[PDB]
Amino acid sequence: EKDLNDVSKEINLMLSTYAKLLSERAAVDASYIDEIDELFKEANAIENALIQKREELRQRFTAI
Amino acid sequence: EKDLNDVSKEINLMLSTYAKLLSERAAVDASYIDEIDELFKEANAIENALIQKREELRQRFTAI
Ligand SMILES: [Cl-]
């Protein structure tokens, strides 16, 4: 007794749910990229600061 | 007046902070993977269900 209209309803409901899942995946990716970007900026700042501390060591070794 | 001991302290502190950043990145990656995995399970369940609904359509089309 389940007819083509019933099956159509189910297909449309599932595709609606898929649209929500796609939107959720985009938001999750944006959040992840945001966190990774902050981490990368901080790691790069640590790297540059380490290069200048290595140059301070170098200057003191040259004074030796 | 800032001696090699001061520079050493600063380098060790920056590398300590870097270790914390690394563990934070690992946690961010685990969290991301957990969310992506749940999304993937849900999307695959939708896909299998849509295949099942396409077969229900197919059976009704065969019924003609
Ligand atoms: Cl790393």
Author numbering:
A (entry chain B), B (entry chain A): 54 to 117
Q: What does the article say, verbatim?
A:
Meiosis protein TEX12 is an essential component of the synaptonemal complex (SC), which mediates homologous chromosome synapsis. It is also recruited to centrosomes in meiosis, and aberrantly in certain cancers, leading to centrosome dysfunction. Within the SC, TEX12 forms an intertwined complex with SYCE2 that undergoes fibrous assembly, driven by TEX12’s C-terminal tip. TEX12 undergoes conformational change upon C-terminal tip mutations, indicating that the sequence responsible for driving SYCE2-TEX12 assembly within the SC also controls the oligomeric state and conformation of isolated TEX12.
Our crystal structure of an FFV dimer in a helical conformation demonstrates a unique, phase-shifted anti-parallel conformation. Instead, its centre is characterised by a stacking interaction of central Y85 residues. Importantly, TEX12’s Ctip sequences directly contribute to the dimeric coiled-coil, while 10 amino-acids at the TEX12’s N-termini were not visible in electron density. In the crystal lattice, hydrophobic surfaces of coiled-coil ends (formed by Ctip and the N-terminus) mediate dimer-of-dimer interactions between obliquely-oriented molecules. These interactions are recursive, generating a right-handed helix of FFV dimers that is continuous throughout the lattice, and is intertwined with another FFV helix in a double-helical arrangement. Thus, while we cannot exclude the possibility of the helical dimer forming in some context in vivo, it does not explain any solution state of TEX12, and likely constitutes an artefact of crystallisation.
